[PDB]
Every structure is written in structure tokens, then in C-alpha cells.
């Protein structure tokens, strides 16, 4: 997996790859690893796929209830504090490695959360197996006062480094741009540079090829 | 003593044009010993179909558990559960046992009655959802099924063509696995009719 977060002047942008794997086999060719905690708080997950989804869904729920109770738009530090207290309680048994990013009344924020409950602050972060390939690109090209279009380019370039050079990462690039005073725009499949080439042959079988023992109508109605 | 490969078995689901297909082998064994050649791994709750591979005691337990839950769902909602909703229920239920899981590889298949859209989904043992346009594979011959599906499959197959593709995918995968085969069943699912076919395959 290759997830990165990049901070620009008026917002934060997170991008991730679309490959899910069991052992050396690719289970999902195009899986979305970007999760909505709240409308303006998004999170990218690496580690145990089930754990990242579950922990994001649980906090996303508690943040919505907290937002309704306080009559206030949720803050990134709230999502971060609730996450890292939950993850710490389970002493790393929940294998969720998250890049949390969003905009709130306080401003734009970018954090990283580890399974054991440690948290980092940064202008550019990278998590997952392809993080070293991504971080190489980020360290080479990142600068202070990035524009929106520069941050998207840098973020997607860092994901691509993972896609090509890391075996764990591949397929497409998902991007989410969270800009201050604007609706967050979720760019699913922002880049699709790994389209399957036309097969040499159609393996559509002549009808009746398969040998059949029995047929029956199944009753789905009451 | 690997729970997922004691009993053995496979499930595969595919999408076609306004139709879905879900298929499974019939073998239940105790490692080398074949015990039953009638053990079906595909169930249904209304128009939503669930295939479950892995440890057979958990296959049986989860079927009984989802029947229980879909029955109470229908009484309270006064309507049959949809595939997208059921997928979430399966995920919730599996992750509830995160630190003592059911050793299973479930596969949801069905057509949304409102939208008429073909839907398939696979899960890992802890309940992570694997949604797919093309196909989902599960069991002891998942590698073989991945190889067969990826080469044979093409989009928008008619129910009668889709039947041939999924059947040849299962059969040839099952023949390269020791713990799979011993008979097979294929469900062809259309909007308001479902055909269930038993395949002839080598019995070794």
C-alpha cells in the first residue's frame, strides 16, 4: 500500500493506491483506501484492511454525534485524539496505520497515526509498504508554499513511485483535496495508468461445453 | 491444523448482462479423507445469495446466524434485505468476532430489486469487504480460480454464456486442488428467475 498526505497553502491533499493483496495475490485490482471520517475530515489507511475500515467507520460515527451535540463542525484534532486513545487501548492489536487530513474552523491539518497509538505532524507524510518509494519523491520535489495543482501533482507522483517500484502497491491513484472555505472534492481514480491491454483471444465458450447433471428453478419469493 | 484448509472447498461469483452467477464445489473432507459429496456452500435469504468457504462448522454457524438476522430484518423493515445492505451486515457480524474469528471466506451475490443492478462482493475472515465488477473467488483453490477467471472472464456475458464461463472456471481450478471438487453447483440469477445447475466433474 502507498498512502501520502501533502499540505498546500489553503488546504491538505491525501492520495492512495487502489491495490488490495492477500499474500502475493491481488484480491482487489481497484479498491478505495480513502475513507470519510466527516465531510471535511478524510483518512487514508494501510495495514489490516478490515481494521482501518472499522476504526475509521467507528470514529466517523462518534464525530458525527459529537458535531450534532456541540452544534459545531468537527475538528481534525478530535478525530486524531479519539483514534489514538482507541488504538493505544488495544496495544497495537488493531493494525491501522492512518494519514488523517482535513479542514475545520481552526484551519488545515495533516497527521499520521500508527497501530500502537503514536501520532506525527508534517507538511508531507507517506505510510504503507511503498512509503520509502513515495517519501524519496516527496523529499526530492516537496517545497514550502505549494499551490493546489502542485500539491496534487507531487502527491500523485509520490503514489506513482510506489505503484511502479513497490510490489505491494499498483493500479490507479485516488486523490482527495480538502481546501479551506470550499467543499472537499474526492477524485476517485484520478490517474488510471495501469489499464489491461486487449487480450489476444476471446475465451467465450460454445454454449453446451460444460456437462450438466441437474437443473431446477430456485424460489426467492414468499 | 490450518482451519481454512481442513475441510476444503471453493466458491466463485461472476457478473453478466442484467444477471449474476455464483458457483461452489460439493466436497467436505477431513484433510486427505473425503467425507461428504453433498456439502453445498451457497445459501440464500430472499433474493440475496451467500457462498461460504473455509471451516465447515463456521460455514453452517454463519448460515444459521444470517438466516436469524435477515428474518428479524424482514419482520421490522417489512421488506427483503438487498445485497448492498446484507454485504454490510456480513462485514459487521464477522468483525464483531475480530479477536476470535470465523475461519470463512464468504461471497455475497444478487440483483438489487429496486435498481436492477448486478452485485457481487467477497470478504476476508475478519470481515474486510472486497467489492468487484467482474468476479469474486474464495477457498483452497483461490489461486487457481484467480488464474481461470482473469483469463476466461469478459464483461456483459448473457446468462447462458456466463454459465459456461463460471462452470469452466470452477471445474478446471478444482481439478488442480486436492481438497476441492467432488461435484459442483452453479446458480444463474436473473431479476425474477433463478436457475440452479449441478455440474458433471471428475470424482477424484
Amino acid at each position: 500500500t502507498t498512502i501520502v498526505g501533502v499540505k498546500f497553502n489553503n488546504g491538505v491533499v491525501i492520495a492512495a493506491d487502489t491495490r488490495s493483496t492477500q499474500g502475493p495475490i491481488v484480491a482487489d485490482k481497484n479498491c478505495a483506501k480513502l475513507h470519510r471520517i466527516s465531510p471535511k475530515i478524510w483518512c487514508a489507511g494501510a495495514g489490516t484492511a478490515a481494521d482501518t475500515e472499522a476504526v475509521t467507520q467507528l470514529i466517523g460515527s462518534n464525530i458525527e454525534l459529537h458535531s450534532l451535540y456541540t452544534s459545531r463542525e468537527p475538528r481534525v484534532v478530535s478525530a486524531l485524539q479519539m483514534l489514538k486513545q482507541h488504538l493505544f487501548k488495544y496495544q497495537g492489536h488493531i493494525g491501522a496505520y492512518l494519514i488523517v487530513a482535513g479542514v475545520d474552523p481552526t484551519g488545515s491539518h495533516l497527521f499520521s497515526i500508527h497501530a500502537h497509538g503514536s501520532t506525527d505532524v508534517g507538511y508531507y507524510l507517506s505510510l504503507g509498504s511503498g512509503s520509502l518509494a513515495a517519501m524519496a519523491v516527496l523529499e526530492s520535489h516537496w517545497k514550502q508554499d505549494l499551490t493546489k495543482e502542485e500539491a496534487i501533482k507531487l502527491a500523485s507522483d509520490a503514489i506513482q513511485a510506489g505503484i511502479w517500484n513497490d510490489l505491494g502497491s499498483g493500479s490507479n491513484v485516488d486523490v482527495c483535496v480538502m481546501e479551506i472555505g470550499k467543499d472537499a472534492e474526492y477524485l476517485r481514480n484520478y490517474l488510471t495508468p495501469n489499464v489491461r491491454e486487449e487480450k489476444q483471444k476471446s475465451y467465450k465458450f460454445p454454449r453446451g461445453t460444460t456437462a450438466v447433471l441437474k437443473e431446477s428453478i430456485v424460489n426467492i419469493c414468499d | 491444523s490450518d482451519p481454512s484448509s481442513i475441510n476444503g472447498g471453493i466458491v466463485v461469483a461472476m457478473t453478466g448482462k442484467d444477471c449474476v452467477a455464483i458457483a461452489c464445489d460439493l466436497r467436505l473432507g477431513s484433510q486427505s479423507l473425503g467425507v461428504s459429496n453433498k456439502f453445498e456452500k451457497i445459501f440464500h435469504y430472499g433474493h440475496v445469495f451467500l457462498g461460504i468457504t473455509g471451516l465447515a462448522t463456521d460455514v453452517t454457524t454463519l448460515n444459521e446466524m444470517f438466516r436469524y438476522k435477515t428474518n428479524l430484518y424482514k419482520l421490522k423493515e417489512e421488506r427483503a434485505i438487498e445485497p448492498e445492505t446484507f454485504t454490510q451486515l456480513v462485514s459487521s457480524s464477522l468483525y464483531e468476532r475480530r479477536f476470535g474469528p470465523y475461519f470463512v471466506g464468504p461471497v455475497v451475490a444478487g440483483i438489487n430489486s429496486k435498481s436492477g443492478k448486478p452485485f457481487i462482493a467477497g470478504f476476508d475472515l475478519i470481515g474486510c469487504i472486497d467489492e468487484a465488477k467482474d468476479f469474486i473467488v474464495s477457498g483452497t483453490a483461490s489461486d487457481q480460480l484467480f488464474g481461470m477467471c482473469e483469463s476466461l472472464y469478459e464483461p456483459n456475458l448473457e446468462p447462458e454464456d456466463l454459465f459456461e464461463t463460471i462452470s469452466q472456471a470452477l471445474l478446471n481450478a478444482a481439478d488442480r486442488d486436492a481438497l476441492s471438487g467432488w461435484g459442483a453447483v452453479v446458480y444463474i440469477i436473473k431479476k425474477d428467475e433463478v436457475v440452479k445447475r449441478y455440474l458433471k466433474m471428475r470424482q477424484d
Binding site: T1, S20, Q22, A27, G47, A49, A50, G168 | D124, C128
Partner: peptide
């Protein structure tokens, strides 16, 4: 299970 699956990883990312």
C-alpha cells in the same frame, strides 16, 4: 486477511 487482507493488507494494503
Amino acid at each position: 486477511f487482507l493488507y494494503x
